[PDB]
Subunit: 594 residues, 3 copies
Amino acid sequence: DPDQFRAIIESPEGAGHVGYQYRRNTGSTMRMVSDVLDERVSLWDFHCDPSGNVIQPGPNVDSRQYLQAAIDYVSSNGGGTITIPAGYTWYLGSYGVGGIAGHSGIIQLRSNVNLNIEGRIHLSPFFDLKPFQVFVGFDNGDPASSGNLENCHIYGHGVVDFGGYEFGASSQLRNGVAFGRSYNCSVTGITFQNGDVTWAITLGWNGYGSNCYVRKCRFINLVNSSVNADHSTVYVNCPYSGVESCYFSMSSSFARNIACSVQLHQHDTFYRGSTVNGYCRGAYVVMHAAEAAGAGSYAYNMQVENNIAVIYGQFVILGSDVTATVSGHLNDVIVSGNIVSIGERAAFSAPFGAFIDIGPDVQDIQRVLVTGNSFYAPANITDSAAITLRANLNGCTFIANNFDCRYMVYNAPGTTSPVVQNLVWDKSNVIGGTHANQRAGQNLFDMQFASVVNSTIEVQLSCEDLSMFSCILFPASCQLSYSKITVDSAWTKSMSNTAVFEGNQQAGANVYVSYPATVNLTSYNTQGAVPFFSTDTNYAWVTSAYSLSINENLDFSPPATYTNKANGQLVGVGYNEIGGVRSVSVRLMLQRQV
Amino acid sequence: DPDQFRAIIESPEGAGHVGYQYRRNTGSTMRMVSDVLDERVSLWDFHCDPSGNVIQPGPNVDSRQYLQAAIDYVSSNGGGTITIPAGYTWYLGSYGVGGIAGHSGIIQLRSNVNLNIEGRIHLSPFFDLKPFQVFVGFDNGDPASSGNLENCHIYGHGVVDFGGYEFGASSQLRNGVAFGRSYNCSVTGITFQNGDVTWAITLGWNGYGSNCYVRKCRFINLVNSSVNADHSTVYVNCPYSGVESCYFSMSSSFARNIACSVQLHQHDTFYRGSTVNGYCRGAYVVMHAAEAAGAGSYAYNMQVENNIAVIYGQFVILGSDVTATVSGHLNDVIVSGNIVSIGERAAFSAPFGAFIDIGPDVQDIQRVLVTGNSFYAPANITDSAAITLRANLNGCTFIANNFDCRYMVYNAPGTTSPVVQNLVWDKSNVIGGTHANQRAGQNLFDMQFASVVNSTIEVQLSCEDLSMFSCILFPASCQLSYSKITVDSAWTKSMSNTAVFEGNQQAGANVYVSYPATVNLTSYNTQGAVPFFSTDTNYAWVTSAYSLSINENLDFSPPATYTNKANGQLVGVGYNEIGGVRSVSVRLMLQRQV
Amino acid sequence: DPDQFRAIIESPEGAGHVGYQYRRNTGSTMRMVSDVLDERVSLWDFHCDPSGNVIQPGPNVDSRQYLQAAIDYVSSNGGGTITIPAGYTWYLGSYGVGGIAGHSGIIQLRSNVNLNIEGRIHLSPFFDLKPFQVFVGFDNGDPASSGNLENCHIYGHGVVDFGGYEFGASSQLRNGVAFGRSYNCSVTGITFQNGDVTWAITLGWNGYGSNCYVRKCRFINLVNSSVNADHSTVYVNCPYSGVESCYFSMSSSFARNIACSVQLHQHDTFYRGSTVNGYCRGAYVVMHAAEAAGAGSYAYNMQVENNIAVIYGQFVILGSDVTATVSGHLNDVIVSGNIVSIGERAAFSAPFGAFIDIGPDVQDIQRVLVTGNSFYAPANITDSAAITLRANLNGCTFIANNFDCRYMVYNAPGTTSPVVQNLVWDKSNVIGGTHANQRAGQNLFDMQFASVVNSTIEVQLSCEDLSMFSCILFPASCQLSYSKITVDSAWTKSMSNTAVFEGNQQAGANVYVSYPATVNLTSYNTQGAVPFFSTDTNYAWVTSAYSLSINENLDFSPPATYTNKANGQLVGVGYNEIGGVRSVSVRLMLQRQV
Ligand SMILES: CC(=O)N[C@@H]1[C@@H](O[C@H]2O[C@H](CO)[C@H](O[C@H]3O[C@H](CO[C@@H]4O[C@@H](C)[C@H](O)[C@@H](O)[C@H]4O)[C@@H](O)[C@H](O)[C@H]3O)[C@H](O[C@@H]3O[C@H](CO)[C@@H](O)[C@H](O)[C@H]3NC(C)=O)[C@H]2O)[C@H](O)[C@@H](CO[C@H]2O[C@H](CO)[C@@H](O)[C@H](O)[C@H]2O)O[C@@H]1O
Ligand SMILES: CC(=O)N[C@@H]1[C@@H](O[C@H]2O[C@H](CO)[C@H](O[C@H]3O[C@H](CO[C@@H]4O[C@@H](C)[C@H](O)[C@@H](O)[C@H]4O)[C@@H](O)[C@H](O)[C@H]3O)[C@H](O[C@@H]3O[C@H](CO)[C@@H](O)[C@H](O)[C@H]3NC(C)=O)[C@H]2O)[C@H](O)[C@@H](CO[C@H]2O[C@H](CO)[C@@H](O)[C@H](O)[C@H]2O)O[C@@H]1O
Ligand SMILES: CC(=O)N[C@@H]1[C@@H](O[C@H]2O[C@H](CO)[C@H](O[C@H]3O[C@H](CO[C@@H]4O[C@@H](C)[C@H](O)[C@@H](O)[C@H]4O)[C@@H](O)[C@H](O)[C@H]3O)[C@H](O[C@@H]3O[C@H](CO)[C@@H](O)[C@H](O)[C@H]3NC(C)=O)[C@H]2O)[C@H](O)[C@@H](CO[C@H]2O[C@H](CO)[C@@H](O)[C@H](O)[C@H]2O)O[C@@H]1O
Ligand code: NA
Ligand code: NA
Ligand code: NA
Ligand code: NA
Ligand code: NA
Ligand code: NA
Ligand code: NA
Ligand code: NA
Ligand code: NA
């Protein structure tokens, strides 16, 4: 049948008739060529017209149904990896159908079906002014009724290009990859670019999912208009999941005001080793009660480490909230090894610059460690703080950071009156000098709170700034109890005010406080050991004080150390070599219970 | 010969007769189809019966000999990568033969032969109740006589499933990958699951090997029975080797009592960026003298950083030991950036909770830096410590950590009496408040040692805990010399005991100590400058003291500062505006040589 | 035409006549075998003689033109990935031509053309004694006229072997991969070995380039002769670029004196997670004004974290410089989590050992944070320092490090006289004890500078070292102002000198200083409250002092605290129970404005 043989060979079954054995090894399987070819699969195997003839991709070709067919087919065989070939741009030109339609989905991902994107995937103008989620892992329009997406990995050296199209309306949503209720899924190596989107990738769905990761990806120019309501490049909404070694860049002015790189919203999540430029915000670390279904109502074991950022707003934002029925809690957080600066901008030209923000809208944030970070803002940016503490806080600890910005602790007066507990600012935090001389009328630690309890503020300057009103100021409206507040004397000799308690709160029974002050004293006339007393009676709270001044006199000396008396004078015993009433003005370290 | 031509084409040599040139490029090599196919290799090329017909894998098919044949064949050509295809589960049903038999080996790995596991590898019930090591890189039953395994990489999106089978006896061993005397080997991307094993991966053999790594792997439910004697998921037994970005999870109760994620046992080894849940222990960092053959008897440059863990026992365990002939030493260790909690459990229901443990069974551990970590244990877990110091220590330094647990330093009285040198607890360690009010009868730093030398403990509270017996207590049995022990006054005003030296050890010539105390004093009756003396004679050791109390009196003041006298009284000079014997009880900061 | 059919099949077009459809799927594209084969490409498709017959690689075969042809061809189709097959060594035996010739180039890389190196690439002896750059991404002999290289990735399990050939002359250059003006390029997984080269990889060109990375690579024995002038394994000369998780090893003696692992020379660059053995230096972090064209004249956001190193010289070297026209600035640097030791060597046998060096040859270095690192040098290495501060510094901050070496701060007297600003050494830096008893004639902090301003040095010992001359010494030639210098008393009771100011600089108006001293005092004879005065008149600068000694006497007590008098005596009020002139020698804490 040698006519039939030639016909068979040229037919689509022809490769199934040509035998093969690996490297002529007689111990190897006797196969057909088609068997070996069938070990791999690409978009070319599905990118064909109804008569089976291949179609070249391009801007007038909608590749969506072909990729979907490929995905569908490989899913039917228990999975595999589909290559999107290099050297070609594959345009997407229509919405998907079925369970992804509720999500404005283009492509449905399926379990165990990996995409090796080596070429480029580009959105056609069909999508201009419309919502879209390019890859969707949900299988139901209602995520609560969705099955899971498992073991789906997107990787390669290729690109997803969003076509530069602006949002049509603020209320729209746009996404690159929504993995859905996603278990062991990942994106590695891909560049996402040239868009106006809400997110590039989302992981999980309200706590459902596990072991999802974004690694070695680039995210470039993904906000481009004033219509875009909000952008967060990666939203991590399942536990045991994270972002590592990624690069995030924006150029748009709008991004400086609206864009965040990462959301960590479930327990055991991380954001590491990544570089951010041009964004408003670095990361939110948040437990929303509305997202607590899959993994509980606590966000714990949250890690933000070893990132590099230039931002215009706030680096890390901490928060939690409630619904009628569920209480969200954020605890057990570490922020460490990050090097962050506020980019060159005018004061008040973007959201208030901060390393840590305690974001408003019942919060419960505690057990946070912020350690071994650097923060810098240029000297003109009045709105820059180590922490903007703008809502209730139940604990945050700062150790061994270097903060070089306008404020250390700040909240705006007569906005919120946060209730503050367990704010620990260790003496090993180094306060930079870039804003020296810029602080007229300002308090370095401006404690504009309802109350402060169980808190520690150990102020240590590293250079002079005599422009500042005070190192630390508590308004009379702020209650202060069971706290330690100290101001180290270095670089403070010429300051009129070091610590200010406008409500005399430092007299509290369990307030432990020390700071420098200038005190005028007068002695009795007695020759010999002689008392010196303060002229003012403002010191009923002082347990001891000691001299920070030299004694220019030969004929007498004031006391080295002082106690107080019931009338609020200080008193100490000096020495009159010759008698006479003495009158001196001395710099003292005032101490209370320390 | 056109009959012969058709026959040739359908034969196993047929692809070797069909010509090919890349993309019709006339400058390309004129090849045959078989040449291009021979560029890749899969298990399908060896998974055949004796007549060459392919065999489908499945639970009634033992794939072992076929994979071994593939490995053997590729090794003969100088190496390559064998694909274990996606969409299939490949069952292993028998032991291997030869040099791996001594190791209970299933598959022998060979140098330069990589395995790309995209499908699933599952153990058949043949292995129920038996020992096994799935992949073995030794080529001799005696590892000391083994050749090396070099340049062998196992990677992909696939899975090794251990079939859920329990151990048959405690004395058995079970492993996933033993690389052997392994140089430039790695496992990346693989999920190891559903087992009862000793290890999932071991790297090296008693110091022999180099540049072995486990990256982006998952390890899930690898302990399931009470028979399992001990589990450590990755054992690193060669230098210049490590674990990074991995995920470790257990669900079994037995795992909470026996399972550790990593062993770092040779120099220049690391454990980074990984997430652990459900394990007893995080990592051992140990030099066993018995393992010192390949790389010397020092474990140095050991790094445990930026991990996330929920454990039930101890995070990092430090140790070393000796044989008759060889002395093991552990030095130059860093533990940093880790965020760790003891999981919800009853007190004493698992091994004692600790961030650092100094593990018993001559140790030599020194030059350890523990910095910028968080640790948390729930308030009910009495058995929780920043360090359980249960064997000899030659040095460990703690700086800028946040420890929130029951004890800071602990050892059980009348177990061991460790000899302690160079324990440094810097003031920048922040002590959390979760266990406040839980510490009746307990010492926060319970120094239950034979001796303490060249040590620093700078206690700083961040909130009150008046339940505790003391901040720090030394029993009379503990010698204390050439040390600094300080208790900051903040939050201590109402404590009866701050530091306790049951053997009066704070009087030592080179002991530098300060802590608060209440002292009753009486003055002479003299008007004017007047001495006040303590009623008790317990202060022969005090170099100075100063007031931590206000003076409620108008008519006199006690001294601000005090020295001592030979009889052990304190003495200072106050001021009697009017004469009369005065009697006061004051809170003082007692100081010795500081 | 069945003769023609058989002929066609055996021809190079034969595979283009054999039909295929994926897995017999009738919905799949009807293709030819050649179409599926054309989805991949290897060196075999170009490694052929002029008649198209394949050539086997080997030491007598020059593979260069064949690889270049492959690269060229794939570039023409918009890119792809070329495999360099496993199981073969591919020798390079000649220079390339054209635009790479100016760079001594062998292979020209092209945009979007990736190289998957699974086999070995070896240099033939043609290259002995000659310069070479194996892979070059420039397209012009003058880099300023070069186009860019974009989207080029080199990866796999293979090896580049430099053939062991020595340099022929010091003035020559040799490189593995020069990416050129390189945007989104990377090298992953490759081992570079057995050479005498200047660099293994360079990224960027004078600030031009972006998003270039070296990951999971090994670099082994890349210096082997005394001819080699200088070696730096990776030179990062574009922003948003870095090195992570790499391994660097040298065995040569010459490497201990000349070799550095990484250069970070542009903003937003990083060096993380890597292990170094046998090198002189870890990393330079430098802004050269001569390299400022592409990305500006500031190196900012520079990160060196979580590395492991054994080196013989300096870990991190900081610098900047100028040209006639351009000023380079280095700022916003973090160095954190690194564990580093000086390898076993004789004192002065290699460049001076240091954790941080401020390298000479107008510098501008500021806003540097050095935190949470360990450093160790063996006790014999006299030339070991936490910082060698050998050129001008505008700021560096040290917090919570553990430095165990001979010096903390050092500069050699009568070499440079650096101008120092904003040097911050926080009290949380722990000073190790390995060099105790080795410091005869040495100052632990040897402040051999022109001047020191706005600086903080808080010395805290952790053990005794009475061998040292002083803890800190300022020569009379060093101006000191607006600074804080403190020496904690612990472990200092027996020291003759703690802080030394050879120019009496501690008297400065804005110098804040405290340290211990022994002081002889004499009292008046008066019974009762009685003054004690120092016999020496060296204390005009002291604001207060207090006792660090016990009082062995019953009949009197010296003052607990002292002030001074205009003549430079100290004075305080003690108590004579019985009268008589008293004479005591006491250890005091001397304080000035603190
Ligand atoms: C851009 C971004 O992520 N911003 C963060 C805030 O997130 C919140 O606003 C977003 C605005 O885009 C999201 O809401 C929008 O999308 C919702 C979800 O889309 C639906 O469900 C999807 C699964 C389908 O595919 C879609 O087709 C659609 O059906 C939609 O319901 C909203 O109407 C719309 O506005 C974001 O919603 C979350 O999206 C993730 C990712 O897709 C998804 O997994 C979640 O299910 C979904 N959550 C919920 C509850 O629906 C929404 O959360 C974020 O709130 C803010 C955190 O900071 C604030 O709150 C802190 C705690 O009080 C406080 O401290 C802080 O100061 C506050 O600013 O951070 C970013 O702004
Ligand atoms: C599970 C685990 O790793 N536990 C750690 C302890 O390791 C020790 O016990 C293990 C129990 O499973 C291992 O011993 C077992 O296996 C030995 C080796 O198997 C043989 O050799 C292999 C190469 C072959 O393939 C096998 O067929 C067989 O011939 C076997 O000899 C023992 O009888 C058996 O109990 C573990 O042994 C090491 O295994 C690694 C990995 O396979 C291998 O590379 C080494 O060669 C082998 N070492 C030796 C010396 O044989 C064995 O080390 C670990 O000791 C402990 C550390 O903490 C303790 O010690 C500290 C220092 O004193 C102390 O501070 C601390 O408090 C102590 O708890 O940590 C885990 O428990
Ligand atoms: C080995 C190394 O990298 N050493 C570091 C120092 O770099 C400087 O010396 C190098 C010696 O090899 C390089 O100069 C050499 O190469 C130059 C460039 O080659 C040319 O241009 C290439 C693009 C072509 O392919 C070549 O064919 C050739 O045309 C050449 O011009 C020089 O003559 C030659 O000596 C190195 O030069 C840089 O090389 C990189 C990587 O290839 C390239 O991207 C740059 O363009 C090129 N730069 C310049 C300006 O040409 C050259 O920089 C390095 O200077 C030192 C830093 O520390 C010192 O300076 C600090 C600041 O003052 C100071 O604090 C510190 O104490 C100092 O030691 O670090 C290493 O030693
Ligand atoms: Na929807
Ligand atoms: Na905390
Ligand atoms: Na209030
Ligand atoms: Na054995
Ligand atoms: Na240490
Ligand atoms: Na004892
Ligand atoms: Na050149
Ligand atoms: Na700094
Ligand atoms: Na000078």
